[PDB]
Design an enzyme around this catalytic site. Structure first.
Site, PDB file in Angstrom:
ATOM      1  N   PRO A 102      -1.934 -10.848   2.751  1.00 47.91           N
ATOM      2  CA  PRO A 102      -2.974 -11.407   3.623  1.00 47.91           C
ATOM      3  C   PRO A 102      -3.152 -10.569   4.879  1.00 47.91           C
ATOM      4  O   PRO A 102      -2.193 -10.026   5.430  1.00 47.91           O
ATOM      5  CB  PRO A 102      -2.443 -12.805   3.957  1.00 47.91           C
ATOM      6  CG  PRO A 102      -0.966 -12.687   3.805  1.00 47.91           C
ATOM      7  CD  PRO A 102      -0.753 -11.724   2.670  1.00 47.91           C
ATOM      8  N   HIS A 124      10.627  -4.446   8.067  1.00 51.53           N
ATOM      9  CA  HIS A 124      10.450  -4.523   9.511  1.00 51.53           C
ATOM     10  C   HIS A 124      11.532  -3.782  10.285  1.00 51.53           C
ATOM     11  O   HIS A 124      11.395  -3.621  11.502  1.00 51.53           O
ATOM     12  CB  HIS A 124      10.396  -5.985   9.953  1.00 51.53           C
ATOM     13  CG  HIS A 124       9.162  -6.701   9.502  1.00 51.53           C
ATOM     14  ND1 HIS A 124       9.040  -7.255   8.245  1.00 51.53           N
ATOM     15  CD2 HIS A 124       7.991  -6.944  10.135  1.00 51.53           C
ATOM     16  CE1 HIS A 124       7.849  -7.813   8.126  1.00 51.53           C
ATOM     17  NE2 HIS A 124       7.193  -7.640   9.259  1.00 51.53           N
ATOM     18  N   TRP A 129      28.431  -6.139  10.630  1.00 49.07           N
ATOM     19  CA  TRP A 129      27.246  -6.841  10.148  1.00 49.07           C
ATOM     20  C   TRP A 129      27.610  -7.875   9.088  1.00 49.07           C
ATOM     21  O   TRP A 129      27.098  -8.999   9.105  1.00 49.07           O
ATOM     22  CB  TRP A 129      26.249  -5.812   9.613  1.00 49.07           C
ATOM     23  CG  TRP A 129      25.142  -6.343   8.757  1.00 49.07           C
ATOM     24  CD1 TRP A 129      25.170  -6.534   7.408  1.00 49.07           C
ATOM     25  CD2 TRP A 129      23.821  -6.696   9.185  1.00 49.07           C
ATOM     26  NE1 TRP A 129      23.959  -7.011   6.971  1.00 49.07           N
ATOM     27  CE2 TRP A 129      23.113  -7.117   8.043  1.00 49.07           C
ATOM     28  CE3 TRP A 129      23.174  -6.709  10.423  1.00 49.07           C
ATOM     29  CZ2 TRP A 129      21.790  -7.545   8.103  1.00 49.07           C
ATOM     30  CZ3 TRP A 129      21.861  -7.136  10.480  1.00 49.07           C
ATOM     31  CH2 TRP A 129      21.184  -7.549   9.328  1.00 49.07           C
ATOM     32  N   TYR A 186      10.289 -13.946  14.659  1.00 54.96           N
ATOM     33  CA  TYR A 186      10.447 -14.926  13.589  1.00 54.96           C
ATOM     34  C   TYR A 186      11.183 -16.169  14.078  1.00 54.96           C
ATOM     35  O   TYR A 186      10.772 -17.298  13.787  1.00 54.96           O
ATOM     36  CB  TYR A 186      11.173 -14.288  12.405  1.00 54.96           C
ATOM     37  CG  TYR A 186      10.395 -13.146  11.792  1.00 54.96           C
ATOM     38  CD1 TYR A 186       9.130 -13.354  11.259  1.00 54.96           C
ATOM     39  CD2 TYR A 186      10.919 -11.861  11.757  1.00 54.96           C
ATOM     40  CE1 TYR A 186       8.410 -12.317  10.704  1.00 54.96           C
ATOM     41  CE2 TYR A 186      10.206 -10.817  11.202  1.00 54.96           C
ATOM     42  CZ  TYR A 186       8.952 -11.051  10.676  1.00 54.96           C
ATOM     43  OH  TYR A 186       8.235 -10.019  10.123  1.00 54.96           O
ATOM     44  N   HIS A 196      -4.422 -17.649  12.378  1.00 54.40           N
ATOM     45  CA  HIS A 196      -4.431 -16.325  12.995  1.00 54.40           C
ATOM     46  C   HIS A 196      -5.802 -16.008  13.587  1.00 54.40           C
ATOM     47  O   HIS A 196      -5.924 -15.626  14.760  1.00 54.40           O
ATOM     48  CB  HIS A 196      -4.050 -15.265  11.962  1.00 54.40           C
ATOM     49  CG  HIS A 196      -2.577 -15.066  11.806  1.00 54.40           C
ATOM     50  ND1 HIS A 196      -1.724 -14.952  12.882  1.00 54.40           N
ATOM     51  CD2 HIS A 196      -1.806 -14.934  10.701  1.00 54.40           C
ATOM     52  CE1 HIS A 196      -0.490 -14.772  12.447  1.00 54.40           C
ATOM     53  NE2 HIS A 196      -0.513 -14.755  11.127  1.00 54.40           N
ATOM     54  N   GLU A 245      -3.774 -17.785   7.699  1.00 53.39           N
ATOM     55  CA  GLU A 245      -4.710 -16.757   8.144  1.00 53.39           C
ATOM     56  C   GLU A 245      -5.839 -17.350   8.981  1.00 53.39           C
ATOM     57  O   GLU A 245      -6.312 -16.706   9.928  1.00 53.39           O
ATOM     58  CB  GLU A 245      -5.266 -15.998   6.941  1.00 53.39           C
ATOM     59  CG  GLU A 245      -4.226 -15.149   6.223  1.00 53.39           C
ATOM     60  CD  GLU A 245      -3.573 -14.124   7.134  1.00 53.39           C
ATOM     61  OE1 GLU A 245      -4.274 -13.553   7.995  1.00 53.39           O
ATOM     62  OE2 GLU A 245      -2.354 -13.892   6.991  1.00 53.39           O
ATOM     63  N   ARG A 276      20.891  -0.981  -2.465  1.00 53.23           N
ATOM     64  CA  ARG A 276      21.602  -0.646  -1.235  1.00 53.23           C
ATOM     65  C   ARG A 276      22.061   0.808  -1.235  1.00 53.23           C
ATOM     66  O   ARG A 276      21.954   1.500  -0.215  1.00 53.23           O
ATOM     67  CB  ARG A 276      22.787  -1.592  -1.035  1.00 53.23           C
ATOM     68  CG  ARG A 276      22.389  -3.039  -0.768  1.00 53.23           C
ATOM     69  CD  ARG A 276      21.117  -3.117   0.067  1.00 53.23           C
ATOM     70  NE  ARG A 276      20.864  -4.461   0.573  1.00 53.23           N
ATOM     71  CZ  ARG A 276      20.241  -5.414  -0.108  1.00 53.23           C
ATOM     72  NH1 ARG A 276      19.799  -5.209  -1.337  1.00 53.23           N
ATOM     73  NH2 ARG A 276      20.057  -6.602   0.460  1.00 53.23           N
TER      74      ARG A 276
END
Ligand SMILES: *[C@@H]1O[C@H](CO)[C@@H](O[C@@H]2O[C@H](CO)[C@@H](O)[C@H](O)[C@H]2NC(C)=O)[C@H](O)[C@H]1NC(C)=O
Ligand SMILES: CC(=O)N[C@@H]1[C@@H](O)[C@H](O)[C@@H](CO)O[C@H]1O
Ligand SMILES: CC(=O)N[C@@H]1[C@@H](O)[C@H](O)[C@@H](CO)O[C@H]1O
Ligand SMILES: CC(=O)N[C@@H]1[C@@H](O)[C@H](O)[C@@H](CO)O[C@H]1O
Ligand SMILES: *[C@@H]1O[C@H](CO)[C@@H](O)[C@H](O)[C@H]1NC(C)=O
Ligand SMILES: *[C@@H]1O[C@H](CO)[C@@H](O)[C@H](O)[C@H]1NC(C)=O
EC number: 3.4.17.23
Lengths: 98, 596
Positions: free
Chosen positions: B328, B487, B459, B497, B360, B357, B151
């Protein structure tokens, strides 16, 4: 890039009509007098065939065998079918229409 | 002469002209990522630059057709996507500033972090592979040491860059008429076209907050049970009556709770359902794995995979020292050039991800029929949802018995299926609060809802209010915890998600009720159920060409974030676990002070 196809035309092509000319297409409200620009696109486009394309985009050779009959003698025929020939026997025969 | 016909002709030109550039970029990227070498490393530069320049030119040209008089919904959405110029809509100085910020974030991610000089021998806990799953062992003090070190090495360095990024992106969004960057993100889920199916951008937040409340008891009881079951790495500051520290929960940020598995399963006598011994004994390789995975989709009526997929795709033996990132990947190139990027080894995770996959790729070839600006998932979380629902179904014991990887005489009971449900609930139930709180914090910050008061305390209290975990040590504003995640560092969407998590179980329950199943959902195999496959294909084909509300309502009856299927899937676990929590009380003390 040796294969090209047309994407824009003013009217639907009549049956068997061909327009090989490459004049600038005017899809807009004003003429462009051969100058490429807004709403004036080149009416020819390239495929850009790569060899890893799938079946849905691989280059397929297409032949449209068209048959035409008019008020003229039929000078093209496909009777490529013949048997042997035997003599001294009473048999049926068709010698080119006889 | 009308504007509509001119726009139609322009889009007809653009869709054809974009295909060659997209294929060039995709092929260059695939060749570079297969093996890192200079001759194809340099290709990606020009490949990206040409595509970006062509897209910028087309976006600039697309301006002269106004959006008011458009009546065809297809061309309306096409132009709305195209007229969304993105980074080309604003001045060049901000463009290069954003490019430099993205490059700095990429360098920060790529560059590693070293420990103190007392132990500099090994400090790469990231690793180029799956080893990032397991970072530190069963520890209490050096684990928090690693947490605080990471952190301090990320936040103190990326705080001002992220602040300036927020400022510039908010200016961008305000210029593009959106309220903020959160408005730009929510615009992907919004539909302002056909009436009755319309969905505004401001409704997603209320839909998420409404759908999260119906599962709060489940998360509460599961968290209480996990905290009571730990019992070993006890909190030295707060008695087990209170809350629990956040660092112990598996991963670095606690996104997944799979690592806690071995520390909490009660029935250790009954082994987890494994096929690895049969996997090796029957001589199973990657080819056999992918053939077996393909049989699953062949059974449900989905088409046979295209020839040349195995030929073009690479999946085994990288060989070269500069090995590719073994994560992947499913690659779609032009049309029909679908392939996979894989690092198959005979393990649990690889076998599980093979179906993901495959899903996908199946979604890709299902929506490939749409135009270029529409061949994509309807929602940002639809693609992962489609992958994970097929990934979740093949792992049923009945499917394993049919395949032959499990003993024909093997019997299940109330001791094994409960373990299966717990194992799959650690990776699903705990992930929802993390995504939800992260995304709501993102929307609050990007919209300027929060003040200049240090966002870290907000947070932390928000995470302990939702995720129910208290931070180990206090922090000031100099840190920026969320940007430590990939991300957020690379500025990717995160609510996909949560949408994936809910939609997975929604389509699972729909297709399994269509699969003439009786009893709990987790025992039903959608194999040889053609009606479920047809129902799924009804939505997979549309892609982005139709509103996502139509893509969700045409299979499942509901039109919104209905969470009942998830609870109907996980009810046996809840009912069994209530007996354990008969004495284990439920509820965490948000007013906990670790410093005191
Ligand atoms: C909008 O434009 C399309 C462009 O062709 C018109 O054609 C329809 O396109 C859709 C694809 O989204 C097809 O499913 C239909 O079968 C097409 N219909 C026809 C008659 O070609 C479409 O008609 C226009 N109008 C609407 C309301 O979509
Ligand atoms: C995995 C892979 O394809 N590696 C390629 C190799 O096949 C090729 O011979 C070489 C030179 O072009 O570049 C690299
Ligand atoms: C009014 C207006 O600017 N319309 C478009 C805009 O979308 C585009 O980003 C920009 C490019 O310079 O100009 C043009
Ligand atoms: C842990 C568990 O599920 N135990 C049950 C038990 O309560 C029940 O009486 C029995 C009947 O078959 O099945 C088993
Ligand atoms: C799929 O393809 C394989 C090999 O190409 C073939 O053996 C199999 O029968 C095919 N299945 C179907 C359903 O077409
Ligand atoms: C599905 O069909 C296949 C076809 O052979 C069969 O082997 C398998 O047992 C079936 N599975 C179920 C659950 O019926």
């Amino acid at each position: 890039y040796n294969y090209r196809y047309r994407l824009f035309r003013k009217s639907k092509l009549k049956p068997f009509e061909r327009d090989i000319s490459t004049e600038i297409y005017q899809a807009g409200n004003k003429p462009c007098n051969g100058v490429a620009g807004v709403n004036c696109y080149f009416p020819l486009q390239s495929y850009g065939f790569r060899p890893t394309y799938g079946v849905g985009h691989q280059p397929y050779r297409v032949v449209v065998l068209s048959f035409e009959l008019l008020h003229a003698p039929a000078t093209v025929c496909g009777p490529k079918k013949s048997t042997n020939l035997v003599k001294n026997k009473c048999v049926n025969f068709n010698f080119n229409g006889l | 002469s009308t504007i509509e016909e001119q726009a139609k002709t322009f889009l007809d030109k653009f869709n054809h002209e974009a295909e060659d550039l997209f294929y060039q970029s995709s092929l260059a990227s695939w060749n570079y990522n297969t093996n890192i070498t200079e001759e194809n490393v340099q290709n990606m530069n020009n490949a990206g630059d040409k595509w970006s320049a062509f897209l910028k030119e087309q976006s600039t040209l697309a301006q002269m057709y106004p959006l008011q008089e458009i009546q065809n919904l297809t061309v309306k959405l096409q132009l709305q996507a195209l007229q969304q110029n993105g980074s080309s809509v604003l001045s060049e100085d901000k463009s290069k500033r954003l490019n430099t910020i993205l490059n700095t974030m990429s360098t920060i991610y790529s560059t590693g972090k070293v420990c103190n000089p007392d132990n500099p021998q090994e400090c790469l806990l990231l690793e180029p592979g799956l080893n990032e799953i397991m970072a530190n062992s069963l520890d209490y003090n050096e684990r928090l040491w690693a947490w605080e070190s990471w952190r301090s090495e990320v936040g103190k360095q990326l705080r001002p860059l992220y602040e300036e990024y927020v400022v510039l992106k908010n200016e961008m969004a305000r210029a593009n008429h959106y309220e903020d960057y959160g408005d730009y993100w929510r615009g992907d889920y919004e539909v302002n076209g056909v009436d009755g199916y319309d969905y505004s951008r401001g409704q997603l937040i209320e839909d998420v907050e409404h759908t999260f409340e119906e599962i709060k008891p489940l998360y509460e009881h599961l968290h209480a049970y996990v905290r009571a079951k730990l019992m070993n790495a006890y909190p030295s500051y707060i008695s087990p009556i209170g809350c629990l520290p956040a660092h112990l929960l598996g991963d670095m940020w606690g996104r997944f709770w799979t690592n806690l598995y071995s520390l909490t399963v009660p029935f250790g006598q009954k082994p987890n359902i494994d096929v690895t011994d049969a996997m090796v004994d029957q001589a199973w390789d990657a080819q056999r794995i992918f053939k077996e995975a393909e049989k699953f989709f062949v059974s449900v009526g989905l088409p046979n995979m295209t020839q040349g997929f195995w030929e073009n795709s690479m999946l085994t033996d990288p060989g070269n020292v500069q090995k590719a990132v073994c994560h992947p990947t499913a690659w779609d190139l032009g049309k029909g050039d679908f392939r996979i990027l894989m690092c198959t080894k005979v393990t649990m995770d690889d076998f599980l991800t093979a179906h993901h996959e495959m899903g996908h790729i199946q979604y890709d070839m299902a929506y490939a029929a749409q135009p270029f600006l529409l061949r994509n998932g309807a929602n940002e979380g639809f693609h992962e949802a489609v992958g994970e629902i097929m990934s979740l179904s093949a792992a049923t014991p009945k499917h394993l018995k049919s395949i032959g990887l499990l003993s024909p005489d093997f019997q299940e009971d109330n001791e094994t299926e409960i373990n299966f449900l717990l194992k799959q609930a650690l990776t699903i139930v705990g992930t929802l609060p993390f995504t939800y709180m992260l995304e709501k914090w993102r929307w609050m910050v990007f919209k300027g809802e929060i003040p200049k008061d240090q966002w870290m305390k907000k947070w932390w209290e928000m995470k302990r209010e939702i995720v129910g975990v208290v931070e180990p040590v206090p922090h000031d504003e100099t840190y920026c915890d969320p940007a430590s995640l990939f991300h957020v560092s690379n500025d990717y969407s995160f609510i996909r998600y949560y949408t994936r998590t809910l939609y997975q179980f929604q389509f699972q329950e729909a297709l399994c009720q269509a699969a003439k199943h009786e009893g709990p959902l987790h025992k039903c195999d959608i194999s040889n159920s053609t009606e479920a496959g047809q129902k799924l294909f009804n939505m997979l084909r549309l892609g982005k060409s139709e509103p996502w509300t139509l893509a969700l309502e045409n299979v499942v009856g509901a039109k919104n974030m209905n969470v009942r299927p998830l609870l109907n899937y996980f009810e046996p676990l809840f009912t069994w676990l209530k007996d354990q929590n008969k004495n284990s009380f439920v509820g965490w003390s948000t007013d906990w002070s670790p410093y005191a």
